[PDB]
Amino acid sequence: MNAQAEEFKKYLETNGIKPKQFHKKELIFNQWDPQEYCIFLYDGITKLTSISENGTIMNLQYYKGAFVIMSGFIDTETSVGYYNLEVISEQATAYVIKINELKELLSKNLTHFFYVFQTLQKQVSYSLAKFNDFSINGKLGSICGQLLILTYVYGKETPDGIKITLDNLTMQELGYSAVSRIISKLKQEKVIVYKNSCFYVQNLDYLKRYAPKLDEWFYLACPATWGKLN
Amino acid sequence: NAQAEEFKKYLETNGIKPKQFHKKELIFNQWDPQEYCIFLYDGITKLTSISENGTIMNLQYYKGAFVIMSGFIDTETSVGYYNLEVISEQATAYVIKINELKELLSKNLTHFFYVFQTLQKQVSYSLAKFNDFSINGKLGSICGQLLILTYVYGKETPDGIKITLDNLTMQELGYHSSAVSRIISKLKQEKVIVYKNSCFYVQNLDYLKRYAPKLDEWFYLACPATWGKLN
Numbered sequence: 180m181n182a183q184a185e186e187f188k189k190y191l192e193t194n195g196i197k198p199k200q201f202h203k204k205e206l207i208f209n210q211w212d213p214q215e216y217c218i219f220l221y222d223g224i225t226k227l228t229s230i231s232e233n234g235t236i237m238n239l240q241y242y243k244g245a246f247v248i249m250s251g252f253i254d255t256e257t258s259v260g261y262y263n264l265e266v267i268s269e270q271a272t273a274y275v276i277k278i279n280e281l282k283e284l285l286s287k288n289l290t291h292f293f294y295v296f297q298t299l300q301k302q303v304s305y306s307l308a309k310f311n312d313f314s315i316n317g318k319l320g321s322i323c324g325q326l327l328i329l330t331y332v333y334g335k336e337t338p339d340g341i342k343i344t345l346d347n348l349t350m351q352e353l354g355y356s357a358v359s360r361i362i363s364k365l366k367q368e369k370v371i372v373y374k375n376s377c378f379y380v381q382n383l384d385y386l387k388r389y390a391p392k393l394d395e396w397f398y399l400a401c402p403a404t405w406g407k408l409n
Numbered sequence: 410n411a412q413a414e415e416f417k418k419y420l421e422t423n424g425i426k427p428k429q430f431h432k433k434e435l436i437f438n439q440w441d442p443q444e445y446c447i448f449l450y451d452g453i454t455k456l457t458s459i460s461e462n463g464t465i466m467n468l469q470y471y472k473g474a475f476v477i478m479s480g481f482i483d484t485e486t487s488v489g490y491y492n493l494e495v496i497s498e499q500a501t502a503y504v505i506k507i508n509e510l511k512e513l514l515s516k517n518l519t520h521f522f523y524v525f526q527t528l529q530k531q532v533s534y535s536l537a538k539f540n541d542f543s544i545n546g547k548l549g550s551i552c553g554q555l556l557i558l559t560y561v562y563g564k565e566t567p568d569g570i571k572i573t574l575d576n577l578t579m580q581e582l583g584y585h586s587s588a589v590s591r592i593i594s595k596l597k598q599e600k601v602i603v604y605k606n607s608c609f610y611v612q613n614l615d616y617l618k619r620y621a622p623k624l625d626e627w628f629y630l631a632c633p634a635t636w637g638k639l640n
């Protein structure tokens with residue numbers, strides 16, 4: 180599956196760093212801490228959020244294990260943004276590292292330096308591809324792109340199409356007014372199907388057509404997974 | 410800058426040389442199988458993409474000093490079918506093949522770090538732009554771009570904050586859809602930015618900060634020195 184992550188997991192463990200369980204609605208890091216962290220999210224699903232003074236809560240970015248999320252800059256160790264990383268799966272397993280300690284240990288392994296660098300690269304190109312799909316096709320591009328990524332990562336073929344294999348609690352979190360206008364177009368056009376309390380994708384090519392740049396991103400960033408359905 | 414001067418030293422020390430590029434040249438392109446690390450030392454560029462048609466998309470602006478990598482650092486393959494186009498009259502850039510580069514980061518965690526921090530800056534820029542648009546729609550995006558322009562190129566004068574860029578470069582950043590037009594009218598109405606004497610002037614910065622709140626925070630956390638100039 181992800182050998183660079185498994186290698187990184189061991190490097191952490193054989194350097195003193197131990198996995199921490201977190202449970203849903205827990206913040207692995209938060210916007211009010213004076214200390215920033217490098218998070219190696221080894222398993223589970225999280226969301227990055229921003230809580231404005233209004234108290235309105237903004238969902239910015241999803242992440243699944245294995246990945247690295249850093250709440251501060253590696254050089255200055257100060258915040259990259261007033262963010263929280265909330266667990267949305269039932270549990271998540273993460274290794275929590277003070278940014279300053281991380282610097283040391285990326286020194287002694289070119290290979291693990293590269294691994295973490297590469298995940299920032301994938302984030303950068305992800306946002307650019309989402310931006311592009313939204314410039315081309317609006318919210319449709321956005322939702323199709325979200326569904327395309329769900330299909331690639333969590334899809335399993337079944338008779339009613341490509342089922343999305345996330346726990347139901349997890350699915351409601353991810354969203355399963357303006358968004359509504361469109362989901363119906365898809366329910367009705369049988370791109371997706373909500374049957375027997377599960378979500379099914381019946382027309383992968385439509386998703387691909389309106390999220391072309393995220394499709395490309397996934398080919399270039401996760402070719403293993405992209406092939407499984409192309 | 411300082412940390413970028415540091416990194417430029419490091420490159421020239423190891424044999425890499427600046428090259429000039431001129432408006433409308435591509436420093437790297439989306440069809441070249443070879444990928445590069447670009448240390449853009451001076452000038453203004455845009456990242457672009459094409460779709461099947463021939464339809465140019467402007468995705469992201471960069472100014473020197475900055476680093477722009479067209480391939481992944483481990484696999485060396487493309488991060489996206491992108492071009493980096495010059496939009497200032499000249500741009501100075503150090504071009505580094507990704508393979509040739511990979512040893513060099515290996516030998517200098519200080520310098521590795523400077524490049525790592527630049528990706529982090531990009532990631533959080535994109536998120537903060539997204540946050541602003543989710544709050545305020547097109548107006549948040551428009552004010553956010555004018556906010557950054559002001560911070561980076563703006564000089565305080567009695568006629569307001571002058572954008573110290575030439576009208577050429579200002580058009581390449583765009584200075585006529587109906588939705589945009591209403592916003593422009595609202596801003597050109599409020600005198601938020603005023604064209605005066607073949608120049609561009611910002612007279613309500615509070616407004617910009619008001620509708621681009623998260624990009625404002627981004628600049629504070631990422632470019633504090635420059636942010637404090639106008640705060």
Ligand SMILES: Cc1ccc(Cc2cc(=O)n3c(c2[NH+](C)C)SC[C@H]3C(=O)O)c2ccccc12
Nearest residue numbers: 224241242243246301302305325328329332400
């Ligand atoms: C529904 C949904 C959409 C997008 C993301 C973000 C995401 C997914 C993904 O598979 N990968 C990345 C991202 N971003 C961090 C760019 S980076 C490369 C790859 C990976 O994790 O190996 C979702 C993430 C989790 C759950 C649902 C997502």
Ligand SMILES: Cc1ccc(Cc2cc(=O)n3c(c2[NH+](C)C)SC[C@H]3C(=O)O)c2ccccc12
Nearest residue numbers: 453470471472475530531534554557558561631
């Ligand atoms: C008008 C305008 C908006 C945005 C950008 C992008 C940009 C500007 C900037 O000052 N910085 C960055 C970016 N992005 C690459 C995130 S990264 C940190 C900082 C820096 O250059 O050190 C513009 C860039 C050039 C010209 C105009 C811009």
Ligand code: NA
Nearest residue numbers: 209210212250
């Ligand atoms: Na924090």
Ligand code: NA
Nearest residue numbers: 438439441479
């Ligand atoms: Na290229």
